[PDB]
Amino acid sequence: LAAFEGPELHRLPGGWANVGIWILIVITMLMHYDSTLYLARYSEKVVVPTAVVQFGPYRWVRHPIYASTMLLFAAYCTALRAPLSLLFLLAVCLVYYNKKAKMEEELMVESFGQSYSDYADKVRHKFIPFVY
Amino acid sequence: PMETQIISDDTWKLVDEIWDKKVEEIKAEAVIQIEEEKKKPQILMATHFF
Numbered sequence: 001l002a003a004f005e006g007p008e009l010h011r012l013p014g015g016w017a018n019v020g021i022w023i024l025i026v027i028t029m030l031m032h033y034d035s036t037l038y039l040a041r042y043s044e045k046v047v048v049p050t051a052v053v054q055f056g057p058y059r060w061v062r063h064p065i066y067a068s069t070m071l072l073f074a075a076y077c078t079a080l081r082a083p084l085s086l087l088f089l090l091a092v093c094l095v096y097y098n099k100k101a102k103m104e105e106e107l108m109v110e111s112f113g114q115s116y117s118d119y120a121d122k123v124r125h126k127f128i129p130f131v132y
Numbered sequence: 133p134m135e136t137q138i139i140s141d142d143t144w145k146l147v148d149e150i151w152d153k154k155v156e157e158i159k160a161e162a163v164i165q166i167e168e169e170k171k172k173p174q175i176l177m178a179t180h181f182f
Contacts, residue, residue, distance in 0.1 A: 047179060065181070069181060
């Protein structure tokens, strides 16, 4: 829908208006890499965390991997300058990622006790910084 | 003779238990030692993203 509702290909501008996708892509790569590194540097096995990760993007948001995938989704959709498809992408990814985040959050709440509870009290925003 | 019985009849049961345990482990591991079917790398670990 971003492809179709977006305008014809060579008419989108350049110059100083194509620096936003650059910095946003750099931000989403940096934040995803930080999230994956901080998630993987503690776990013994593939996904078996030992302690609670509360460093880097985890101190801005409770699920930075999913929000980074979300942000590169928005980056592709914004490179072609189509807000409505970005909104529908946001809706569907919010629904599924929120469902999966709810199951994983209740799993680590059950498994870790008070630690993830105080971590979630420190940072409530699940996907978007002070928006969700 | 002046010598009555010595260490036990109980630690003999303990060393017999150790002997039997190791014997059964050796007997088991001599039959089911090799069952290898496949080793595929999970280069698409879906729980990380999907």
